[PDB]
Design a protein around this ligand. Sequence first.
Ligand code: 4LU
Ligand code: 4LU
Ligand code: CA
Ligand code: CA
Ligand code: K
Ligand code: K
Ligand code: MN
Ligand code: MN
Lengths: 428, 427
Amino acid sequence: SHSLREWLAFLEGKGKLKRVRKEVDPVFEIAALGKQADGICSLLFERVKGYAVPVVTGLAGDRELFAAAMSVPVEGMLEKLAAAVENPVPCRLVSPDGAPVKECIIRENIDLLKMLPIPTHHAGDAGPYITAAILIARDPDSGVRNVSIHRLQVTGPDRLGILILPRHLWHFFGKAERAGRPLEIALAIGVHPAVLLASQATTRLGVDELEIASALLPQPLELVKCETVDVEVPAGAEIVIEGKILPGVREVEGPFGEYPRYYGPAAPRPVVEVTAVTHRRQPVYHTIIPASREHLLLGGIAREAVLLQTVRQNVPTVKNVHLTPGGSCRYHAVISIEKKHEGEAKRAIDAAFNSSSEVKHVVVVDHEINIFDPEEVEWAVATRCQPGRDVTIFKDVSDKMGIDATIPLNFERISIPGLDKIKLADYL
Amino acid sequence: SHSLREWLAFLEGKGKLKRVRKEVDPVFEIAALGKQADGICSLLFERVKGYAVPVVTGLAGDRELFAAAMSVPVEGMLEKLAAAVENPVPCRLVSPDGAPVKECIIRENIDLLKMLPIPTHHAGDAGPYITAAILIARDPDSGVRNVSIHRLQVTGPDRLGILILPRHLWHFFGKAERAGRPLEIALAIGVHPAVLLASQATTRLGVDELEIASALLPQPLELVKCETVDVEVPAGAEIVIEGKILPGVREVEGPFGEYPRYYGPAAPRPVVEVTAVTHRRQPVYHTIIPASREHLLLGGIAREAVLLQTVRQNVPTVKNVHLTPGGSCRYHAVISIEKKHEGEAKRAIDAAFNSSSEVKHVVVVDHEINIFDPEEVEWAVATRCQPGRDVTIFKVSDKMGIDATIPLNFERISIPGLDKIKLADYL
Ligand SMILES: Cc1cc2c3c(c1C)C(C)(C)CC=[N+]3c1c([nH]c(=O)[nH]c1=O)N2C[C@H](O)[C@H](O)[C@H](O)COP(=O)(O)O
Ligand SMILES: Cc1cc2c3c(c1C)C(C)(C)CC=[N+]3c1c([nH]c(=O)[nH]c1=O)N2C[C@H](O)[C@H](O)[C@H](O)COP(=O)(O)O
Ligand SMILES: [Ca+2]
Ligand SMILES: [Ca+2]
Ligand SMILES: [K+]
Ligand SMILES: [K+]
Ligand SMILES: [Mn+2]
Ligand SMILES: [Mn+2]
């Protein structure tokens, strides 16, 4: 119930899952074929050289599918996401007996690369990477639960290197290693997209992203206890890897192809020792190809929800916001307003820059411009921006720019009568 | 030989011409159906309500077809066009006997709307407009020949309103009206796309765009004398309308749906009296739908050729230029350079702004960015522009330059085998 498998069923019946029955190499070929499907359809690789386990990529690659994953029309997606962040819903603990992720359990002679078709994605990558695992951990002093997604380099049979940015997991790990103790974690792979989307919520220090996922789903998310660590994982996941981040240890992780289409450099980083693996009988392995639409939209939609709220606080006339793919759904923002007073553009711009330190470039347009169409936003810039009046620059870590491409308060688009009414097919 | 009719044959055998056998109204419906084919294929309307004459639109709607019209691959289009501008080739004057455009000649009781299926394109338009006529005229003092395309409002049986922007024809007409004389002109409709493309060259004051067209074609363009005016027109055109712009007369022309997807406002403007119409037996009438890909690329390609040359003068490391469709193939420029020294971005920007008054926004990127892909240019701006260092603003329109090149002293991620492996062969 609201598992990856049901999501794959939903995609199949919509003709947005295609299978690939011919054998593929997990080294580069999965990523290469996945890139050609980016944004059009999900691919299920039924034969991966060296493995009985299939690989799925591109579960959702456009805003219509993420809206479907949340049971909303596109129009309501951002508000539904912000409502889930504001009002989390408890998860239900469930028995391990009959939980699909407990069907097979491995505690000895663990070899991750032997069990799982973990791909190698881009040319410069140090080796195979796990890119779609939600990482569940608890604060070792306050006990609160956090979920985030981290790249994990497969460095041995039972060892992973992990990039941890200075956010919540880092805070937890900091506390474990001041006490000289490991931090217990669980990794879950093959979950519903709503759960992945929930793992990208940026919140204050103590809100459990699994509870956010619970609010987005039709029923509460069902959890089960791990075998070897005191952590909870989604009962319906495909695969769970249990382990611990080792105190003090630093090993070289990287380099790795990342979201902005550049390499993340190699450096000494924490290490996870894996103490168990559990999975469904005949699991599906999910990978996210870095810088794909799936990768960009996961974080993007979450950042857009926050951006809409921040901008709406200061500019109640805001109709919509979009973090463009060109900007890695992060650096570039387009904001539509139903403008009433001159001065609204500047306020929307100032608000976008407080949404996150990442936003670098902001364009503001009138409500009738479709901000999801780059050609129409460019047209609005071309015809409605006078740069001496309409451009502000922030100099001083990143420079930033704001562009007011709204019509001044005191421009009708040309059209052809009959164009909705008449179809070229009926005349040929 | 290198007529509109041969061009339509070339499009048919490439599956890029579709015929429309059902009757269509020239008022709005041609434009509406044409807009749905914009950029996919040319349409020949075989039955236009009220007329024996068919209408063709969208002769070329992409850079591949304009390259074919010039007998070049896309990669060489801009250089081939600039070479033709630099080295024009004389036209051949030819006898009126046997010239196809002389087959039928009308000198009396001329009613343009009765003879020709002249469309009404957009809702706000003042009436039917001729949008694909090349206008040939000579300087009444220096005698040099010019070609340009002007919208012509059909205002009576033998009368047209004309928008003339302050460029070469304006200069000529200025001189005719200080002498109190009309300016004799000819309008040709239904020509090969190379000729239309040549009419959009922006040159210094005395180079004959018909000679540019001659250089682009496989053999020199054949011209013939007009019946009632001292002007030359293409022998192979479908239709020629002869006449004169009247000295002093000003009548309201407009409004009209234009290139940037806004209405051009109504105002008092010059007027053409028509003194004759000649055509092929059973002519085809060509219309250009305003703001279509055909409209935008005709002007765009010509402005890109000139822009590449101007920028190359000061920045020999320039690889390519693109005027984006977002900017109406006019306002927004993307310039790729193989950068050697810091400072090349600023020089490319400063040169683009002197190329033409119209360019408003310039982005400079490294040679490996595909400048025809807006998402990849945006990505370059997102990752390689620091606006405190990389944005210059010039203060009629303000202008902005963006340097989105890598600073000199950033590898793009990639997947081995991606050219070699095809999704269709695996599913
Ligand atoms: C969706 C997604 C998010 C990644 C991510 C990727 C994906 C697909 C990759 C797997 C393909 C590779 C890089 N990732 C990392 C990352 N954060 C981090 O600290 N280390 C990472 O390696 N991020 C961002 C991180 O998951 C989010 O910013 C979290 O919301 C942080 O959560 P928190 O606020 O609870 O700490
Ligand atoms: C291709 C094209 C070019 C038009 C044009 C259109 C087309 C389809 C229209 C017909 C559909 C609507 C508006 N047009 C006009 C126009 N120039 C002008 O002075 N008045 C106009 O009405 N332009 C631009 C003009 O033809 C070019 O700038 C010439 O190169 C100017 O030539 P010149 O340098 O010899 O003066
Ligand atoms: Ca503005
Ligand atoms: Ca730069
Ligand atoms: K999170
Ligand atoms: K011209
Ligand atoms: Mn958190
Ligand atoms: Mn000229």
